[PDB]
Write a protein that binds this ligand. Structure first.
Ligand SMILES: CN1CCN(c2ccnc(C(=O)N3CCC[C@H](C(=O)Nc4cccc(-c5ccc(C(N)=O)cc5)c4)C3)c2)CC1
Length: 121
């Protein structure tokens, strides 16, 4: 129903760059679209096909992990932990794991497109 997805966490495409970002559905607005509040505080309407109802991003998913500066790279989700309700992902790269905060994990277009079958609205 209309309220079923309100407050659910998603990973959804930002049209401008093809990447899928963490956020929550805030409203079913019709015409196949939902109002999203992204974790960066942007609120806008996104097509269901561009929303992965996927939280946490599961084990063995290839993601883009963001570091300090201009450093980002592909890695594989190998773990999850909470620290005061904020989520961290354990990302494996070249046999070495590091913890990343939720907003330091995004999906390239290709990485998000892989999950549409299983998680897309
Ligand atoms: C939902 N929002 C809407 C606004 N969005 C953009 C607007 C304009 N321009 C860009 C962009 O493509 N550029 C080029 C590249 C360098 C910059 C940039 O996006 N830098 C940046 C660096 C580190 C982390 C993030 C980040 C991580 C997570 C989230 C999240 N989960 O919400 C949002 C942003 C962004 C800017 C992105 C980001 C997504």
């Amino acid at each position: 129903g209309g309220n079923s997805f309100v407050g659910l966490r998603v990973v959804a495409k930002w049209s401008s760059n093809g990447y899928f970002y963490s956020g929550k559905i805030t409203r079913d607005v019709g015409a196949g679209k939902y109002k999203l509040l992204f974790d960066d505080g942007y609120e806008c309407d996104v097509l269901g096909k561009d929303i992965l109802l996927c939280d946490p991003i599961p084990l063995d998913t290839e993601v883009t992990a963001l570091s300090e500066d201009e450093y980002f790279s592909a890695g594989v989700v190998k773990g999850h932990r909470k620290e005061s309700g904020e989520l961290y992902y354990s990302i494996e790269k070249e046999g070495q794991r590091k913890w990343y905060k939720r907003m330091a994990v995004i999906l390239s277009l290709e990485q998000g497109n892989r999950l549409r079958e299983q998680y897309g609205l």
